[PDB]
Swiss-Prot record:
Mg(2+) 2 binds at D216, D314, D315. The modification Phosphoserine is found at S29, S42. Residues 210-328 form the RdRp catalytic domain. The N-terminus is phosphorylated by host PRK2/PKN2. It comes from Hepatitis C virus genotype 1b (strain HC-J4). The chain holds residues 2420 to 2982 of 3010 of the full protein. This is RNA-directed RNA polymerase. It is a single-pass type IV membrane protein. Activity is up-regulated by PRK2/PKN2-mediated phosphorylation. RNA-dependent RNA polymerase that performs primer-template recognition and RNA synthesis during viral replication. Initiates RNA transcription/replication at a flavin adenine dinucleotide (FAD), resulting in a 5'- FAD cap on viral RNAs. In this way, recognition of viral 5' RNA by host pattern recognition receptors can be bypassed, thereby evading activation of antiviral pathways. Its cofactor is Mg(2+). It comes from the Viruses.
Length: 559
């Protein structure tokens, strides 16, 4: 069937849409070429619509069926729990889109009478009505990027807040536990960046002659078929479930997940969806299971030897045993034709790689640096272009989510996050005297409230003390960073070092947690290094839950 059907009504914005980076003294000190930074808007929606609208092709074979059964066998060991209304409410983000039924996220979290009562009625409706398609709103996603030598906005589809709370009750536990049970070490969201690097490195070194490749599916969500979504449900159904959860899952599958009507911000009928909606609770888990199922089966059909996969939603990376240059190239081609038959055609053509550091998965690549002892240490990095552009945007405009904070946490060991992001934002927080202000950021799609002053402990727990001592980065990594800066008009690293020295001194003079940030975060800035010992508060933070599962588009808030 067609992934989408359109009536002609336009995808409209619910407010003014900013697309240009403001000329601000704070953002200008970080990035001067402001005209190179832009934010996607509804103005390019039609372009996106064109790319994601097509008739899907899907042929399932014995390999697919074999792998599916293997997966259901593992799903069968799972017992999922129904979340209470209260628990589901507490998982709703403070700034989540309000319901059209007279209440918002605030009311949901405070368990207000109107919100709870409506949520109960929506739940009872899921138990009673197994067929009526649930309404969804379609919006053009607002994302920031750097112009290329531009990207159309992504389309986000989500149901009303009441429905979202119900999804949590019936499926939060399932999407939080089932993926790991089914895919084991292949489920990427169970790993912190350091553990992900560890897994990739060990897997790579565990092969006699390793060969790896990233596989980019062309607009994955639109390739997900009704069959795929019902197969996904068949896996969920293997869990032990409360009767009402089993029905809610059955109802949500047919009324929402497999497709439904699309309504714009103006309340007009935009068309119909018959593929994956980006904004429902099962999207991350569903895409991961679907991608893993198809790829595992495709690997068998292609005859790839000793395959080890790592999947994060629609992002896939495979490491296997090389069978020779020409043999690998032909096998990868076969793999792609098998994925294509499974309705997961390639976006960027896949290519075999024989150097782990040259593989990009989850927009990241493995690289090497050295610790104080001089020992080699692997860590996760990426091209800093998007992170810097977004840091500049969030510097000039207020944003609910701070990608810069999430980037510092996730890429704390990198040359760019340390010299630029930390320096830039700590200097601003110092000037505005807001170091003790907790800020929101997302990790694997879930929203977290984090205090900047706790970054030293956080970083130590997730990355280890080496994150504060890495040096002698690879020439390739240094060049990528340096060239990126010249491109964006970001001051050269020498300028950042000078600014860092001043930020460090200021932080130390304040003492307390502030001084700790100066000592650990900026020890790289001084020649007379200080002794960095394990932070007492570090080995005490409850980071359990940070890297358990993916929740992108899931409307999840962890507190
Ligand atoms: O050690 C490096 O690879 C390196 C790369 C770029 C620059 Cl500007 C300085 C470098 N040497 S350095 O100042 O000791 C340093 C170590 C860690 C950081 Br972050 S900066």
């Amino acid at each position: 069937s067609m992934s989408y059907t359109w009536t002609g009504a336009l995808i409209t914005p619910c407010a003014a849409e900013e697309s240009k980076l403001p000329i601000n003294p704070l953002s200008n000190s970080l990035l001067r070429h402001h005209n190179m930074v832009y934010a996607t808007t509804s103005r390019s929606a039609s372009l996106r619509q064109k790319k994601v609208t097509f008739d899907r092709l899907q042929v399932l074979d014995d390999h697919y069926r074999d792998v599916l059964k293997e997966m259901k066998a593992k799903a069968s060991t799972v017992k999922a729990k129904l979340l209470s209304i209260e628990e589901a409410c507490k998982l709703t983000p403070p700034h989540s889109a309000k319901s059209k039924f007279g209440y918002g996220a605030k009311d949901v979290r405070n368990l207000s009478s109107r919100a709870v009562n409506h949520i109960r009625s929506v739940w009872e409706d899921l138990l009673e009505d197994t067929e009526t398609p649930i309404d969804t709103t379609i919006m053009a996603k607002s994302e920031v990027f750097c112009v290329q030598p531009r990207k159309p906005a992504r389309l986000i589809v989500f149901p009303d807040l009441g429905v979202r709370v119900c999804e949590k009750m019936a499926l939060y536990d399932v999407v939080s536990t089932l993926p790991q049970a089914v895919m084991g070490s292949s489920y990427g969201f169970q790993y912190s960046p350091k553990q992900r690097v560890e897994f990739l490195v060990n897997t790579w070194k565990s092969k006699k002659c390793p060969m790896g490749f990233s596989y980019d599916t062309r607009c994955f969500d639109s390739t997900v078929t009704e069959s795929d979504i019902r197969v996904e449900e068949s896996i969920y159904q293997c869990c032990d479930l409360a009767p009402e959860a089993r029905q809610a899952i059955r109802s949500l599958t047919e009324r929402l997940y497999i497709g439904g009507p699309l309504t714009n911000s103006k309340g007009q009928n935009c068309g119909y969806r018959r593929c994956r909606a980006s904004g429902v609770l099962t999207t991350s888990c569903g895409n991961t299971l679907t991608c893993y199922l198809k790829a595992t089966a495709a690997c068998r059909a292609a005859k790839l030897q000793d395959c080890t996969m790592l999947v994060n939603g629609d992002d896939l990376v495979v490491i296997c045993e090389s069978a020779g240059t020409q043999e690998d190239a032909a096998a990868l081609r076969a793999f792609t034709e098998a994925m294509t038959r499974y309705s997961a055609p390639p976006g960027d053509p896949p290519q075999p790689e024989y150097d782990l550091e040259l593989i990009t998965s989850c927009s990241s690549n493995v690289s090497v640096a050295h610790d104080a002892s001089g020992k080699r240490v692997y860590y996760l990095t990426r091209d800093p272009t998007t992170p810097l552009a977004r840091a500049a945007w969030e510097t000039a405009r207020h944003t609910p989510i701070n990608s810069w904070l999430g980037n510092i946490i996730m890429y704390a060991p990198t040359l760019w996050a340390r010299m630029i992001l930390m320096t830039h934002f700590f200097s601003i927080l110092l000037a505005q005297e807001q170091l003790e202000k907790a800020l929101d950021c997302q990790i694997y799609g879930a929203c977290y409230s984090i205090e900047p002053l706790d970054l030293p402990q956080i970083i130590e727990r997730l990355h280890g003390l080496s994150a504060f001592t890495l040096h002698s980065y690879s020439p390739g990594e240094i060049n990528r960073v340096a060239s990126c800066l010249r491109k964006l008009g970001v001051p050269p690293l020498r300028t950042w070092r000078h600014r860092a020295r001043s930020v460090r001194a200021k932080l130390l003079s304040q003492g307390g947690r502030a001084a700790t940030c100066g000592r650990y975060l900026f020890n790289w800035a001084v020649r007379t290094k200080l002794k960095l010992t394990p932070i007492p508060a570090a080995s005490q933070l409850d980071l359990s839950g940070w890297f358990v599962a993916g929740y992108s588009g899931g409307d999840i808030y962890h507190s």
